[PDB]
Symmetry: C3
Subunit: 191 residues, 3 copies
């Protein structure tokens, strides 16, 4: 009856996972949110500040299924990391959108795991586009605990939220980075 | 012409009252917001942290009419209290909605009395549903001064905002609690 | 395809300029946002806390064109000041709306220059209307760096944001003040 984001979120959530890290750096237990970017390979994109110095990475799908995961790549620069699910089965990958098509007045939605109690959704608009970090929005407060996905009304990934209003690495940037991790195990800066 | 919440708020506001407390605890003057939950009896639901240790409770309707009120019940647990208007006349009660029907992407509106200058309205969506406190939303910042009603687009009460993003006791929870106060003068926990 | 404020913002932005001050008070470099209120005269309205104690005022249009500007009036009271562009050419003035027509549930948009990296847009609704400062909204957080324009869905100026949720001097108030500066070089309080 009344307008709601519930419908689209019902399509997106299956791509959003929750991360539980147990590493060290001379214990230490961090926790975060992630997005399945490749269903067959089980490629989950996330914040580097969550999986950094991890000994054990655990992933849980919105349906409640739990999996193990391993690091495949990371980049302190953008706070973007890539993990891979162990024995992935029946996974749903988010569809990425063309960041370049983003306009400021655009409505965005941020999904995350701020307390480890599950997923939290917030809304806003694109505040600024083209300090650093390509995307800025009021849809996600600048929290060192707020990462996760940045999605548009069509439920497509426009960016990944990170900590330094909020800043997110735009999806095109994320595609380029992560894929670069898959092939090189790391992101090679240019010249 | 342009979309606005003004229309629905014009229907809801008559159910929203403003509370002015004057108690003690060995003066002390607190102030808050409330919602008329029963028009005939003049049952106004509110935050316990506002009416706690009250000697004198005063209520003012959005039309400007002032009334006296007495405590009927309270519950430190959920920050929910119930007061009753003295000699209530021509009152409007809010219609409660089924909390269980709540979905995250849902739009919500919070109404309150943050400065004693009148009512303040803010909007957001249901961030999280099923730490504690059943409802979480970005429509009301986590303020020890922000309580009041949590309403949906149809102008129905979905919860009462309280202090520990924001957390609200869902309406079904509120119904159960308050009614329990009416009959027992207090809320009896289970086993 | 999807609803967005981008269309209307595309019409409004040309009226929004960015201010760069270089004054003193025994250097000192401040920066802010402004709104072209008169295209022929090049009258730009802004916050007093930005142009106060200015030796040099510089303005840059959203298209990138830069201009010099001089003070014509100011008012510490409301944090409203008026500057005039030197040799103004092909300027666009914002259309002001009737503040008196404002209702609380109304959607608003705030435009500003919080970091000097360009314009930042945020959205919200009118929280409170009729402490001080006529307009209150969640569309602009209470920031000593957040000033700029307060606009409605039709892209009309309903107020100017200022620092003391957010507070803005309503447009009618702004019209009265600024015009009073043009004629008297200052705002003469009444009796
Ligand atoms: P975050 O900026 O905010 C939580 C702390 C409520 O946004 C998340 C949902 C990505
Ligand atoms: P609160 O969380 O915020 C005020 C301090 C602006 O929300 C009220 C309107 C319930
Ligand atoms: P401000 O209250 O917020 C920035 C600090 C993000 O709003 C501006 C855009 C007027």
């Amino acid at each position: 009856q009344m307008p709601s984001l519930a419908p689209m979120l019902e399509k997106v959530m299956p791509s959003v996972v929750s991360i539980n890290v147990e590493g060290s750096t001379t214990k230490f237990m961090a926790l975060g949110s992630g997005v399945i970017i490749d269903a067959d390979k089980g490629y989950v994109v996330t914040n580097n500040h969550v999986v950094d110095n991890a000994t054990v990475i655990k992933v849980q799908l919105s349906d409640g299924r739990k999996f193990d995961a391993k690091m495949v790549g990371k980049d302190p620069r953008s706070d973007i990391a890539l993990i891979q699910i162990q024995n992935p089965k029946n996974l749903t990958a988010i569809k990425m959108a063309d960041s370049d098509a983003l306009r400021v007045g655009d409505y965005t939605v941020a999904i995350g795991n701020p307390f480890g109690l599950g997923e939290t959704v917030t809304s806003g608009i694109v505040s600024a586009l083209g300090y650093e970090n390509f995307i800025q929005t009021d849809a996600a407060i600048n929290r060192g605990n707020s990462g996760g996905a940045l999605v548009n009304l069509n439920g497509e990934l426009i960016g990944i939220n990170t900590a330094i209003i909020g800043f997110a690495i735009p999806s095109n940037m994320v595609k380029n980075l992560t894929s670069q991790m898959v092939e090189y195990g790391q992101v090679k800066r240019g010249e």
